[PDB]
Design a protein around this ligand. Structure first.
Ligand SMILES: *[C@@H]1O[C@H](CO)[C@@H](O)[C@H](O)[C@H]1NC(C)=O
Lengths: 165, 48, 189, 137, 132, 49, 49, 48, 121, 91, 51, 191, 145
């Protein structure tokens, strides 16, 4: 169990829009055995009160799917909660409002990092900072996995949607 | 067609309910219980 | 509504300790006849009780005949609980069987049926009786949904894929068939 | 008009020494239709007898005889973490656990239907005739 | 539809039996598990013969509207093509409907004088023979 | 699904629901039967104009 | 409303595994059995003179 | 590699062992029907 | 699903059918037949008594003795609940089956009327 | 794994686990000149002789593991060409 | 005189699975077993109708 | 008087052989003759992820009998049984099928596997499109009585029969006679 | 067209029996095959009747210095307690192999996807594949990564 300082004065309104997941550094079974089958993962952020409405588009067997979740607030600005065995703690520590975004997730005493960007390509300095942070997070370089830079879903359908909320 | 299936030609293990029902089968010819067995477990089994 | 007279009082029962009588329904309300609030059945208290399986074991209040191999096995076979009582020094195996739930829909299969009203009667078969047997049938709905944000993993929910079969059920016959037919008739004269 | 009618009761058969019971039966002559009166009674009868004749009821077993199902399971399948001798007769009085695989694998998809009896005359599936249990390559 | 990839990759999770190679049930009963194997197998053969004679489904009354009779215990229900209602499907919105011919119950075998069966289409084969 | 309401309702008399082997179970049951009969036959559209 | 108590239960819990979502309810001993068969229908008809 | 002590299968080896010493076409026909007529020598897995 | 007959609804309709499947059909046998297949052994007397009681019940509470209009006899009230006409209280060739006559033994019926009108014991 | 059966102590020959060279098994197969399909495997391409020799590919930082049977490995990837065009018109 | 009658009805059934009840060694509910034990050997229409 | 007749008999039967991705390109048939590019790539990946064992090379199965009780005797008897199996239901017994159809033997019944764009009882109807050269090819007859082992050779001598080359097609390819060394209990069963 | 019904001649002469399950092998040949969807056949091909045993039945093959399996496939003792599918048919032996030495399978997880299909047989005149004959799932202890 670890906890760091989130982004100072995080604004969900200025953070809204379409985000694109680039790299995720962690030690998970799907990341190490099925990491070669990863695809383009995009994110959609929509503010809802203190919480954050979250939509995720990703190609599963070619057909796109919509993952709708609601990151419940933990009472502290910057930190969020998500529920399904396990508790997810979303922590945003270092990000701007125009080019990149870094997220921290915790589950079952395991830490994980996520790199989000508004568009491709990603700046080399952002990737260097992400590598430095994932190395400071007691994670090795081999646990870093890059994602394709194309094939992002435009929009899903009523049938292809997730209903965690 | 999605998958191929084949049962072993010999040395197979039978179900315990079918085991007990066959142990309950008589020796003298009685079409009633044999017809009940046919109605409860079918007339054949799946080899392929 | 025309109802006959009350029948003669039947003999008192030792265990029930009640009286009974009934009558017949001669003429119901066809068009405008006056209805009869009174029913054809009745009961009465009695005070003439006199005296109130033979197999390996029997429940205390219910006459369910149970073998001794089902006593102290981690499964309540009697509603009163006479099978899992005083089982102090008895090991109870789990078999990885009590974690999974029985087949959905046994309630309707355990109910009776009345062809006159097309309604469901009380429980007929015991939908919770297993008799120590643990049979599992592979379900077909093991593809619903599951997501993992921390691992970025999308796959089918692998929590519950097993259906337990009660003793009173022969087989659940997991299969799949579909026949859809629409009929259309357009005539003009 | 074609209401179900069953033939007369067959002649009494000799009392089976092994099953200590005598049996009689009847067969269908005309099936019911058009919501007619069906044959709503048992097509067979069972009566108790007094068996006086030698019978080879029990069958020998080389391996260990299971306590509940009475199966002739070899000792090589005992104390292997598997439930082979039936409901709860296996895995009793075991010092150590072995022979179990690591990842706790599942069974084949749809193998349950492949182990049940089939009626080729009506294309309907019936009770399970094959023992598709676990019993690891 | 175009979303049939769902059906394609989901049939893998719940497949149905397409082709069947049958084997008689008395061959499944072995002597190592049940005593008196020969007598049990002979009785099973005779019972299967009498059962096939009983559940041939030809004894049911012929349906109408090109229906297919189906035997189930003591009840017989007519499965009709789409477009017909009612028991035996005598009411339909069409005239001079082409009725597919169906075969009746085949006659019993002759007592060793030369086995031959008769069959009337009142479209299966007939004139089956077995040497005595 | 959150809040349902009755559609079809099977009928059953109240005097059949009285607890058995009570103080005056049978007599009170017959009395409530007579009472419900007199209630349903006392005032209705049949007696009005 | 209910003229009787419907919360009392006699002995071992009787499972009520049915419904839209994955949730397990209880059936009181006072109720013999309750099914979740959710039938539905509607009709339409027009005519002209 | 075809010429070697190829580990045979349980059903195949069992059926081959249950074959009678004297020439009997009955079991030979059933074994040929169940197992086929030829085994793999070479060849890729090209689609179609 | 009743509102629309498009492909948009059938998807979640089948999904919910997977969630909660109703009974599509079922074969039936009289309740006195299950007593023969009990572990208690011979119950021939009780079985015959219950069979006679069921034969009398299927005649006392049959749909024919109920008020003519589909006639549904429930308890002591007679209803058809409509023909979907909304003409009157009971929602009034026509066709109607008469009730079974008393066991002579013969059993006659009267009024096209489909089915049998003569029964013999 | 016969050599490492009961070794009480081992000497680290390579500091880090490296990936093997892709398509390295095709470099060990035999060639039957008569058949037009070269042959099955004759040489082993997983043996490394203990020496953890490697090579750094272009923009492929993760090093590849060179087997002992390969003396020299070089990356000279480059294309090498036929072109034909014909047009007919009649009016 | 013009008449146009058109009835287009569809009955579609999609079965999830089949179920088959056992014929021998059936364990009845405790309520039904009590009711059966509570039936007298003499013919009584009231108790049998209640059952 | 105005009379008009329209007939558009268009049909297809794709053969796509990945278990799940089979349905896509095959069901895309409605109003889309050409298959989708992305769907084709997905099916290619899927059929790479699942084998397509067809297109094999074969060798005599009886050679696998190496270390079993009565190995060589059973091997020779399996050779004889395989020869008897091959010549007992050889499709030569079946009559030639119309329109160049290919006959097979399933148990005790001949089945004329119809060529593409053909159907019927004996592949006689549906001659709308042939798309081939045409004619009637030749077919080898059934093997005659085996040689009495005078000097070990064979005298089967497969010859032409009731389906001769008539429509200008090529004759049945293959040898006329065969020759080997008779077993004669295989030298009294190996010494 | 003219339909053709099947008709078989008398069965071949009798054969010997030496399998302790005496049965006179009486094979027959269908001289006239069915065609045009006619009568396939009615009578069975083979016939099993009583027989007289002349030669003794063959005993099981000698299992020399090889640990036997549940089925009978005798393999070398080099695979004893190898922590993998040693017998390649069942886990009967299992060598009480709790202390698994040499790090079994050296952390190698999967074989080729469906090598079981490669193990399957082949039929030529029917175009349909057959059952698994060659146990390609073997390893011989020699892990080939
Ligand atoms: C079903 O809904 C769609 C979308 O609203 C509509 O276009 C269609 O007409 C509807 N079907 C009907 C009304 O039969």
């Amino acid at each position: 169990i670890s906890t760091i300082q989130p982004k100072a004065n995080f604004d969900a309104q200025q953070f809204a829009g379409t985000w694109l997941l680039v790299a995720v550094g962690s030690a998970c079974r799907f990341l190490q055995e099925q990491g070669h089958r990863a695809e383009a993962t995009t994110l959609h952020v929509a503010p809802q009160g203190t919480a954050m409405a979250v939509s995720t588009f990703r190609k599963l067997d070619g057909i796109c799917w919509q993952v709708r979740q609601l990151y419940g607030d933990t009472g502290v600005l910057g930190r969020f909660l998500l529920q399904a065995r396990g508790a997810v703690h979303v922590v945003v520590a270092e990000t701007d409002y125009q080019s990149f975004a870094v997220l921290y997730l915790e589950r079952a005493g395991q830490l994980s990092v996520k790199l989000y960007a508004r568009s491709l390509p990603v700046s080399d300095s952002v990737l260097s900072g992400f590598e430095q942070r994932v190395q400071e997070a007691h994670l090795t370089e081999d646990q870093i996995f890059y994602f394709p830079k194309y094939g992002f879903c435009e929009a899903a359908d009523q049938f292809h949607v997730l209903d965690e909320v | 067609e999605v998958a191929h299936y084949k049962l072993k030609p010999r040395s197979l293990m039978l179900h315990y309910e079918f085991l007990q029902r066959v142990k309950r089968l008589p020796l003298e010819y009685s079409y009633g219980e044999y017809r009940d067995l046919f109605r409860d477990f079918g007339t054949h089994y799946i080899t392929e | 509504c025309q109802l006959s007279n009350w029948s003669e009082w039947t003999d008192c029962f030792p265990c029930q300790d009640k009286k009974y009588r009934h009558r017949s329904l001669l003429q119901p309300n066809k068009f405008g006849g006056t209805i009869c609030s009174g029913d054809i059945w009745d009961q009465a208290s009695c005070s003439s009780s006199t005296t109130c399986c033979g197999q390996d074991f029997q429940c205390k209040e219910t006459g369910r005949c149970l073998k001794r191999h089902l006593v102290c096995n981690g499964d309540q076979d009697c509603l009163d609980g006479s099978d899992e009582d005083d089982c102090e020094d008895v090991r109870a195996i789990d078999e990885d069987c009590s974690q999974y739930e029985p087949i959905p829909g046994s309630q309707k299969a355990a109910l009776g049926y009345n062809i006159l009203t097309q309604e469901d009667a009380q429980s007929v078969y015991d939908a919770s009786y297993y008799g120590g047997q643990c049979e599992t049938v592979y379900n077909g709905e093991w593809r619903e949904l599951r997501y993992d944000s921390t691992c970025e993993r999308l796959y089918y929910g692998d929590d519950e894929k097993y259906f337990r079969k009660p003793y009173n059920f022969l087989k659940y016959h997991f299969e799949a068939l579909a026949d859809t037919g629409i009929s259309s008739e357009f005539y003009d004269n | 008009p074609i209401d179900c009618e069953l033939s007369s009761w067959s002649s009494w058969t000799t009392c089976d020494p092994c099953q200590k019971k005598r049996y009689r039966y009847a067969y269908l002559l005309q099936p019911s239709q058009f919501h007619g009166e069906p044959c709503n009674f048992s097509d067979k009868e069972v009566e108790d007898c007094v068996t006086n004749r030698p019978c080879r009821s029990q069958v020998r077993c080389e391996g260990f005889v299971c306590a509940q199902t009475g199966r002739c399971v070899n000792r090589r399948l005992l104390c292997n973490g598997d439930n082979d001798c039936g409901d709860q007769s296996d895995e009793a009085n075991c010092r150590r656990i072995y022979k179990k695989c690591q990842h706790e694998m599942d069974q084949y998809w749809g193998i349950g239907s492949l182990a049940s009896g089939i009626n080729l005359f009506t294309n309907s599936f019936e009770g399970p005739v094959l023992d598709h249990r676990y019993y690891c390559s | 539809a175009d979303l049939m990839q769902e059906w394609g990759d989901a049939v893998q999770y719940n497949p149905a039996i397409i082709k069947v190679k049958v084997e008689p049930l008395y061959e499944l009963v072995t002597a190592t598990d049940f005593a008196y194997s020969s007598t049990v197998r002979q009785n099973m053969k005779q019972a299967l013969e009498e059962f096939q004679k009983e559940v041939s489904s030809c004894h049911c009354a012929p349906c109408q509207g090109n229906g297919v009779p189906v035997l189930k215990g003591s009840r017989c229900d007519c499965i009709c093509p789409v477009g017909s209602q009612g028991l035996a499907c005598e009411v339909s919105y069409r005239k001079n409907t082409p009725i597919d011919g169906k075969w009746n119950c085949w006659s019993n075998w002759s007592s060793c004088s030369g086995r031959r069966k008769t069959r009337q289409r009142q479209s299966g084969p007939a004139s089956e023979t077995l040497d005595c | 699904n959150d809040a349902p309401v009755l559609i079809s309702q099977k009928l059953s008399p109240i005097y059949n629901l009285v607890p058995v082997k009570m103080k005056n179970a049978h007599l009170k049951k017959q009395n409530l039967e007579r009472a419900i009969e007199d209630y349903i036959n006392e005032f209705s559209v049949r007696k009005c104009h | 409303s209910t003229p009787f108590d419907n919360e009392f239960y006699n002995g071992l819990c009787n499972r009520d595994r049915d419904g839209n979502t994955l949730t397990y309810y209880r059936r009181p001993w006072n109720v013999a059995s309750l099914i979740y068969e959710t039938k539905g229908e509607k009709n339409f008809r027009t005519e002209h003179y | 590699n075809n010429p070697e002590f190829l580990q045979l299968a349980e059903p195949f080896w069992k059926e081959l062992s249950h074959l009678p010493s004297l020439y009997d076409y009955s079991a030979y026909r059933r074994l040929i029907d169940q197992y086929g007529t030829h085994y793999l020598q070479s060849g890729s897995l090209g689609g179609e | 699903l009743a509102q629309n007959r498009s492909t948009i609804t059938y998807r979640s309709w089948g999904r919910s059918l997977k969630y909660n499947p109703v009974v599509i059909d079922f074969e039936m046998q009289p309740i006195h037949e299950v007593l023969r297949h009990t572990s208690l052994g011979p119950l021939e007397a009780k079985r015959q008594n219950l069979r006679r009681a069921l034969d009398q019940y299927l005649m006392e509470f049959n749909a024919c003795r109920c008020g003519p209009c589909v006639p549904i006899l429930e308890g002591t009230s007679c209803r058809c609940q409509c023909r979907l006409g909304s003409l009157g209280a009971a929602c009034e060739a026509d066709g109607s089956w008469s009730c079974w006559s008393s066991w002579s033994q013969e059993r006659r019926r009267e009024c096209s009327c489909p089915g049998r009108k003569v029964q013999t014991q | 794994n016969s050599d490492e059966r009961d070794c009480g102590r081992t000497k680290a020959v390579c500091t880090r686990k490296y990936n093997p060279i892709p398509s390295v098994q095709l470099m060990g197969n035999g060639f039957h000149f008569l058949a037009g399909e070269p042959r099955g495997e004759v040489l082993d391409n997983s043996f490394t002789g203990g020496i953890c020799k490697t090579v750094k590919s272009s923009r492929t930082s993760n090093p590849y593991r060179v087997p002992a049977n390969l003396e020299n490995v070089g990356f000279e990837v480059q294309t090498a060409t036929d072109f034909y065009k014909d047009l007919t018109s009649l009016g | 005189n013009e008449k146009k009658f058109i009835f287009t009805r569809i009955f579609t059934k999609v079965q999830t699975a089949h179920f088959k009840m056992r014929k021998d060694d059936i364990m009845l509910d405790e309520g039904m077993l009590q009711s059966l034990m509570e039936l007298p050997d003499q013919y009584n229409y009231g108790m049998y109708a209640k059952f | 008087a105005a009379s008009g007749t329209q007939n558009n008999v268009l049909r297809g039967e794709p053969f796509i052989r990945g278990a799940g991705f089979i349905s896509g390109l095959s069901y895309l048939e409605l109003d889309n003759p050409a298959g989708n590019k992305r769907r084709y790539s997905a099916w290619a990946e899927s059929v790479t992820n699942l084998p397509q064992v067809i297109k094999q090379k074969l060798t005599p199965l009886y050679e696998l009998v190496k270390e079993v009780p009565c190995a060589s005797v059973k091997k020779l008897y399996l050779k004889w049984a395989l020869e008897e199996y091959l010549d007992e239901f050889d499709p030569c017994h079946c009559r030639p099928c119309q329109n160049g159809g290919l006959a097979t033997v399933e148990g005790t019944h001949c089945l004329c596997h119809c060529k593409p764009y053909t159907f019927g009882a004996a592949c006689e109807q549906g001659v709308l499109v042939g798309n081939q050269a045409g004619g009637v090819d030749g077919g080898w007859s059934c093997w005659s009585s085996w040689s009495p082992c005078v000097q070990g050779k064979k005298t089967r001598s497969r010859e032409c029969n009731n389906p001769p080359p008539s429509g200008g097609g090529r004759s049945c390819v293959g040898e006329t006679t065969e020759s080997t060394q008779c077993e004669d209990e295989e030298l009294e069963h190996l010494r | 067209s003219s339909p053709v019904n099947c008709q078989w001649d008398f069965y071949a002469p009798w054969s010997e029996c030496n399998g302790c399950t005496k049965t006179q092998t009486r094979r027959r040949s269908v001289a006239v095959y069915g065609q045009y969807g006619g009568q396939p056949c009615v009578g069975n091909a083979f016939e099993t009747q009583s027989c007289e045993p002349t030669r003794g039945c063959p005993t099981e093959e000698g299992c020399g210095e090889r640990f036997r399996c549940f089925s009978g496939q005798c393999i070398s003792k080099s695979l004893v307690c190898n922590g993998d599918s040693d017998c390649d048919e069942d886990s009967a032996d299992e060598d009480r192999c709790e202390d698994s030495e040499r790090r079994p399978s050296c952390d190698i997880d999967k074989p080729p996807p469906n090598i079981e299909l490669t193990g399957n047989g082949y039929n030529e005149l029917t175009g349909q594949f057959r059952n698994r004959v060659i146990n390609t799932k073997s390893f011989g202890g020699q892990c080939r990564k």
